């Protein structure tokens, strides 16, 4: 039972600084060493640096060295990682993954934190749903959908039903546009719970923390 | 420092193949080589320690091999939840390396994209925008061309789209292309239509719909 | 009337050269070697030498073998003022000799428990192991945890030194008297050998001074033959000419070669105080000094094709491996090192064998330059026996080592020899340096060699005594004096305080010679000119 929980998105102007955290749990905290992995999108992973729970013991990359700072609380076993000078650069996620002394393998990690460094405003998402017309052929399937337009930054999350059920659902990539985020979600259901039952897409914005919820209607 | 070079970007393979991914050092690593897995959107996960040992809570069917620069990971059966990014990483010198990283993709049968298009909502016309959509569902490959058609004549103009990830069930991909429109221009306009090319047919599948009240 | 001489140029030549080789040699020069631009690091070693330390070396064997005197009485036919620098070094080898032989009886505790078919540092199955202790030949898949330890390492830690029974410079009490009785070995085979005077420590070197070659040959042949040993020697060798863009790792080998060459302390004055007057100290010198470096160049060999068998044995990144850069790099890795070997048991014998006979030779010069001070200091009030100021020595030596003794004694062997012996050393190094160069004067000291080899010292050795040496000792007490290192040792950082506790044991050495200088200048009568006029002037 192994579990690193971080913390959530952060949305931070260029030049100020954000805090990370790693709760971790399952395990003998003072066993192991705590690192950090930078991940930017699309790039690949990038160890910034490890350090020792038991004192501290903080070992940085040659390529972070005064750009990141580590930290330990073992009266709660949590780690943290403060980032000072933010740019457009440093604008990726980022990991918290538990490591041996050796072999330095990352047996464990984090679920990760999607930090954003930009001076655009936080942006409440448009949620406007996307129903099938009244003319359409319903056959042995009906696929609906809901539309998310406008919202900074990338962190939004779309459920169908409290998350059952989700057997066949499409969800589309955020496409980035003067500033703004905009994506769509569909859901291929049959023709036997639509539009009979509650069928309800909610959209969530942790960044703004507002939760819009839309029901299909035909 | 180190760098550990990873020279296809991408692999191609069907269910139940044989795939083999390569790892080259900078220098002389012997044992120390690991194999980490992340899908997509997820974080990594610890596959192969040590060139060939598994972790504790991995298959049978994947292996690792290589002792020196280039390296070996290996899968013998290919699953459809088998799709991720592989990435190998160094751990013997200060600091740690990781790879450029290969993304596996699946390769399977042509499917039949069903498409599905939509009308503005009366939430979004309240707002003062209307955005036809045009949903492009479980078809392989990814390359595909999508037209758009307002009433007879090629819009190109407020197109965006969107090709989400291979799928882990069946390998499918999906896209999404939207015509983001005003009300003005929309009320102004019926049955709008858009249609798609792809190689399992010749002829376009085509979507269309009226503004009438469907 | 008059003394003794030697009783063949070798005993003495070989004898010099017992004093110059140690263990520093052994495991000090490869590791900063190392981590300083690797094979790199050859280039600044060398030029540190040819114009800092040879000229020191030479320079100091010239006038034990001029004037043949100690190291006191020599200041009264040059600088009378500067005699106390005769006592003050006196006073340095008192704190010198406290920890130097505890590491040989580290050594010595380590030989007489290697005669065991089975290794005790090998399995984890003994009285002083802990949980955390994990061997080899054991179960596979083993992953190395934070609080985890190596059967070495423990063996090293709660047995033979017992440093966890200390909480440092603190409480480092009791006494073990395991160390106590080894270390009273060494001091009664250290006296066997100088007690007779310069007949038995030109006799007893040719044992201690031969063997370490022989081993070094044989660990060298161990060590070729392992797999994997090119990591070491590649780590050891890889050119990092980046390295030498920074100000520190020229002092570091220029610290390096002076420690090793160690002159500037009155030993080699009174080694060369004992031998023919028309001998050569040119050729001598020269051999003598190309020795301690060669011989520190192949023991680097010997250390990281061993070390490079470990990496390759571990997983690589050989600095990891010799991370720690003390005695752990001997008494742990390398011990570990050779109990995965056929014939362990051989091996670690005639390795701690040889850490032993690399010691003792370095301790007889050590004791030995001294002793010959001081007898010619105060004559015939003294020498009336040998064995008897060498045992009062040797004794004051062994009840001054039973701080070092105690369970937090490694501790003190640090403090003592980083933050208290050093800047002293190379203090009194200085204070020589300028005495010999600008006091006495190069021109006579140039004349005085003109008269013993027959011909005049060439300009380059004349213009490394004005100017290059003063300013080379000037360069490592000045780096030094303006950033002492942080201490650390067994995951134990240093209080804050310590450096003012060294200092403290540092400046209490030298004392004697500005309260000599004032002693001779409020004796002597007349003008303050006068005094120090024949206080510069050698006695009429
Ligand atoms: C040899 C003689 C002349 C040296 C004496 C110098 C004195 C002032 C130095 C030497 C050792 C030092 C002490 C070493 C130990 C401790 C214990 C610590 O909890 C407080 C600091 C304290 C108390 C230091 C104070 C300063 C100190 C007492
Ligand atoms: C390794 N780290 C840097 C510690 C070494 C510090 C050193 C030292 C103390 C005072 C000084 F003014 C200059 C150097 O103490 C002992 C010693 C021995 C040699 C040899 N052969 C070389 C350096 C030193
Ligand atoms: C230099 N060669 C390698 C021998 C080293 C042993 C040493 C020595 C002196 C007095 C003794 F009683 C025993 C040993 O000789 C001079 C010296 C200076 C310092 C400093 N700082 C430290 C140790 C010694
Ligand atoms: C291992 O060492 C740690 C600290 O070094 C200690 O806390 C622990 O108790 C040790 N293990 C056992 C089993 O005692
Ligand atoms: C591998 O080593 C780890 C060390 O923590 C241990 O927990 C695990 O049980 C080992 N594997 C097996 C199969 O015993
Ligand atoms: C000749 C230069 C002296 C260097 C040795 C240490 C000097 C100490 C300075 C004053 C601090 C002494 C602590 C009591
Ligand atoms: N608590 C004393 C620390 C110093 C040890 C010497 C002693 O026991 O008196
Ligand atoms: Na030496
Ligand atoms: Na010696």
């Given at each position: 039972e192994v579990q690193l929980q971080q913390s959530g998105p952060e949305l931070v102007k260029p030049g100020a600084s954000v805090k990370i955290s790693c709760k971790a749990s399952g395990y003998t905290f003072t066993d192991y060493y705590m690192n950090w992995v930078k991940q930017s999108h699309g790039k690949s992973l990038e160890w910034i640096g490890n350090i020792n729970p038991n004192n501290g013991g903080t070992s940085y990359n040659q390529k972070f060295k005064g750009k990141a700072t580590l930290t330990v609380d073992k009266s709660s076993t949590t780690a943290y990682m403060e980032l000072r000078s933010l740019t457009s650069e440093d604008s990726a996620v980022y990991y918290c993954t538990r490591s041996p002394v050796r072999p330095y393998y990352f047996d464990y990690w984090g679920q990760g934190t999607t930090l954003t460094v930009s001076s655009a405003k936080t942006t409440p998402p448009s949620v406007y749903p996307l129903a099938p017309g009244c003319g359409d052929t319903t056959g042995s399937s009906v696929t609906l959908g809901c539309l998310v337009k406008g919202y900074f930054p990338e962190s939004v999350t779309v459920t169908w039903n409290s998350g059952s059920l989700s057997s066949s659902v499409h969800t589309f990539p955020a496409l980035l546009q003067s500033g703004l985020y905009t994506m769509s979600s569909s859901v291929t259901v049959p023709s036997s719970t639509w539009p009979s039952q509650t069928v309800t897409c909610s959209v969530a914005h942790p960044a703004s923390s507002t939760t819009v919820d839309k029901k299909l209607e035909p | 420092d180190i760098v550990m070079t990873q020279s296809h970007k991408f692999m191609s393979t069907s269910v139940g193949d044989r795939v083999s991914i390569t790892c080259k050092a900078s220098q002389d690593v012997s044992t120390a080589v690991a194999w980490y897995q992340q899908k997509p959107g997820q974080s990594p996960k610890l596959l192969?320690?040590?060139?060939?040992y598994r972790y504790t809570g991995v298959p049978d069917r994947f292996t690792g091999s290589g002792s020196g620069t280039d390296f070996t990971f290996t899968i013998s059966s290919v699953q459809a939840e088998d799709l991720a990014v592989y990435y190998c990483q160094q751990h013997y010198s200060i600091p740690r390396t990781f790879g450029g990283g290969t993304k596996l993709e699946i390769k399977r049968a042509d499917a039949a994209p069903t498409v599905s298009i939509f009308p503005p909502s009366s939430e979004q016309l309240t707002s003062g925008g209307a955005s036809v959509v045009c949903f492009l569902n479980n078809?392989?490959?990814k390359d595909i061309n999508v037209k758009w058609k307002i009433d007879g004549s090629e819009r190109q103009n407020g197109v965006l789209n969107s090709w989400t990830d291979q799928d882990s069930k069946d390998s499918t991909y999906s896209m999404s292309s939207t015509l983001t429109l005003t009300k003005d221009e929309y009320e102004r306009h019926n049955s709008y239509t858009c249609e798609a090319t792809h190689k399992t047919s010749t002829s376009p599948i085509v979507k269309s719909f009226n503004r009438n009240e469907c | 009337g008059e003394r003794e001489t030697w009783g063949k140029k070798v005993d003495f030549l070989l004898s010099v050269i017992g004093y110059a080789v140690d263990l520093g040699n052994v495991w000090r020069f490869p590791y900063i070697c190392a981590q300083n631009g690797?094979?790199?690091f050859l280039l600044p070693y060398t030029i540190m030498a040819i114009f800092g330390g040879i000229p020191l070396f030479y320079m100091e064997l010239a006038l034990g073998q001029y004037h043949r005197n100690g190291c006191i009485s020599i200041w009264r036919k040059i600088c009378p003022i500067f005699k106390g620098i005769g006592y003050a070094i006196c006073i340095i080898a008192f704190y010198i000799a406290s920890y130097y032989n505890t590491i040989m009886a580290w050594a010595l505790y380590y030989l007489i428990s290697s005669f065991t078919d089975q290794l005790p540092w090998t399995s984890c199955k003994n009285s002083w192991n802990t949980g955390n202790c994990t061997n080899y030949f054991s179960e596979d898949n083993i992953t190395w945890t934070l609080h985890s330890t190596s059967p070495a390492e423990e063996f090293y830690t709660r047995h033979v030194l017992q440093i966890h029974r200390s909480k440092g410079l603190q409480d480092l009490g009791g006494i073990s008297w395991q160390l106590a009785l080894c270390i009273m070995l060494i001091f009664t085979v250290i006296y066997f050998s100088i007690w007779k005077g310069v007949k038995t420590s030109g006799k007893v070197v040719w044992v201690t001074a031969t063997f370490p070659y022989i081993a070094l040959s044989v660990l060298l042949v161990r060590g070729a033959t392992l797999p994997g040993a090119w990591r070491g020697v590649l780590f050891y060798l890889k050119?990092?000419?980046?390295?030498?863009?920074?100000?520190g790792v020229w002092i570091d080998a220029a610290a390096q070669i002076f420690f090793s060459l160690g002159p500037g302390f009155g030993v080699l004055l009174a080694f060369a105080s004992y031998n023919k007057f028309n001998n050569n100290c040119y050729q001598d010198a020269l051999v003598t000094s190309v020795v301690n470096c060669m011989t520190s160049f192949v023991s680097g060999f010997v250390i990281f094709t061993v070390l490079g068998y470990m990496a390759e044995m571990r997983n690589e990144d050989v600095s990891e491996v010799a991370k720690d850069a003390g005695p752990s790099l001997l008494f742990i890795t390398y011990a570990e090192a050779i109990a995965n070997m056929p014939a362990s048991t051989f091996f670690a014998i005639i390795f701690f064998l040889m850490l032993i006979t690399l010691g003792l030779d370095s301790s007889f010069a050590g004791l030995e330059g001294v002793i010959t001070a001081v007898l010619d200091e105060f004559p015939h009030v003294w020498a009336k026996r040998r064995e008897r100021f060498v045992l009062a020595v040797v004794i004051t030596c062994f009840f001054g080592s039973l701080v070092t003794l105690t369970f937090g004694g490694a501790y003190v062997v640090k403090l003592l020899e980083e933050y208290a012996t050093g800047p002293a050393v190379l203090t009194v190094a200085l204070i020589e340096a300028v005495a010999v160069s600008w006091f006495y004067g190069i021109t006579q000291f140039c004349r005085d060699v003109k008269e013993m080899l027959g011909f005049s010292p060439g300009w380059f050795w004349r213009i490394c005594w004005v100017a290059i040496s003063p300013l080379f000792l000037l360069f490592i007490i000045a780096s030094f004096l303006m950033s002492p290192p942080q201490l650390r040792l067994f995951q134990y950082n240093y209080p804050y305080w310590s450096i003012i506790l060294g200092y403290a044991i540092g400046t209490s050495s030298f004392i004697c010679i500005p309260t000599y200088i004032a002693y001779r200048l409020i004796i002597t009568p007349g003008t303050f000119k006068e005094r120090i006029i024949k206080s510069i002037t050698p006695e009429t």
């Open positions: - | 192969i320690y040590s060139a060939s078809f392989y490959p | 690797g094979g790199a050119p990092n000419w980046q390295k030498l863009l920074e100000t």
